[PDB]
Structure 1
Amino acid sequence: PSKLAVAVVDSSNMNRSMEAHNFLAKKGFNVRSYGTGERVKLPAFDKPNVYEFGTKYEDIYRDLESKDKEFYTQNGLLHMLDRNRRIKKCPERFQDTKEQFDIIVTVEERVYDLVVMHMESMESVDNRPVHVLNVDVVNNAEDALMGAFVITDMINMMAKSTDLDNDIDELIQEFEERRKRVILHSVLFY
């Protein structure tokens, strides 16, 4: 709708960012998504499915298919991978992107810290500011869905503004009240 470049960031770039990516893209937003982790982690507690960033969603689908096609259909991981492979080729790492945004949405405070640490670690060149917001999304299919609606609700309200910089703090303040949520908000520079 608006000319806003939006990015949704999580740990793996699998469940929470992709649920929000999918809904924001369907609303017509210029959206990109990233993961803040070292590697892509998929669900024993001590036995996870680990992949490097840049590994195709299709290859991860056919890897967990050949591992156990029945188990990974019952836990909904193959259903998730089906959605992601339709959105883009592979999960991407935020720390490696050269893309610039107007708004960056993190799904948890731990991710927020990783995004802020990373952008602060780099010398600013363009002196271009970016709003970094945190919307707490619990890492499970049901909460990733509810969360994606909140993030879409928040980005839509912000897209309506004729001057986002001048209205953003009041918009967050009323959004927080209505939705009974805490939205951490920082400003970083490119």
Structure 2
Amino acid sequence: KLAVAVVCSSNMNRSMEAHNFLAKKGFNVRSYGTGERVKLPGMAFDKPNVYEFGTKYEDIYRDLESKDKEFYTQNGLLHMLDRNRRIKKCPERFQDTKEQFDIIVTVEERVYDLVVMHMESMESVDNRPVHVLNVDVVDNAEDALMGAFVITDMINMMAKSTDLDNDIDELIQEFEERRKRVILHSVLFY
């Protein structure tokens, strides 16, 4: 019943996986990235595949396939892109998006800093609150859904709350103790 957004850095792995779960659960959710360019793993640790933040996931899939068709279907990148084409049209940049939410769950500290850093950029008349919650999650694809699970278990809990803004500060305190995690939470204005 609330607007949610998950944010990793390339809106490829983590963010999408949480995006899937939160959606198949019924939650109103969007997913973005903060990076400059979508970047995926390549043949080396120093040789990746970088793309425009506007390219179709469909084309990125076409691209990889018309290259190391084998390699990429194996490590997962092709199936992953397969899971994404069926939800969103193509990866989006958080920074540039008129869309607005109540809860913005980032997936890495590094990003948490960008989402906030940019939230403090403009300032509108709306003046209604949005909570930026960080829930660390390894960029790895295996942990991706392992994080979604955590990520949804927390929003699901926060979901059912007649007055989020007040007790949300305590729900986090409880979620922190139940999952033995460190949920960075900061206050930004829309």
Tell me the TM-score range normalised by the shorter chain.
over 0.9
Of 29, 32, 35, the residue aligned with 1:31 is 29
SS in 2 for 1:162: coil
| Cα distance per residue 1:62-113 (max 9 Å; x no partner) | 0000011100011100010000000111000000000000100000111110
Matching residue of 1:75: 75
Whole-angstrom distance in 2 between the partners of 1:62 and 1:81:
10
Distance (whole Å) between structure 2 residues aligned to residue 81 and residue 18 of structure 1: 10
Cα distance between partner residues in 2 of 1:110 and 1:141: 18
Once the two structures are superposed, what CA deviation does each residue of 1:30-75 show, in whole Å capped at 9, x if it has no partner? 1000000000000011101000111100000000000111000111
Q: CA deviation at 1:123?
A: 2.4
Unaligned runs of 5+ in 2: none
Q: In the TM superposition, what whole-angstrom CA distance separates every residue of 1:122-169 from its partner, at most 9, and x where no partner exists?
A: 123311211000000001111101100000100000011111111101
Name whichever of 57-66 and 126-135 sits farther off: 126-135
Identity %: 99
Determine the C-alpha separation between the residues in 2 that align with 1:140 and 1:65.
21
Output the TM-score relative to the length of structure 1: 0.97
> 28-37 or 119-128: which moved more?
119-128
| Equivalent runs, 1:1-190 vs 2, <5 Å | 3-43=1-41, 44-190=44-190
Which contiguous aligned blocks of 4+ residues in structure 1 show a shift greater than 3 angstroms? none
Distance 1:189 1:166 in 2: 16
How far apart, CA to CA, are the structure 1 residues paired with 2:91 and 2:125? 27
Q: What's the TM-score, normalizing by structure 2?
A: 0.97
Q: CA deviation at 1:121?
A: 1.3
Runs (5+) with no aligned partner, structure 1: none
Q: For 2:179 and 2:163, how far apart are their aligned partners in 1?
A: 23
Q: Root-mean-square deviation (CA), in Å? A: 0.7
SS of 2:35's equivalent in the other structure is coil
**Alpha-carbon offset, residue 178 of structure 1:** 0.7
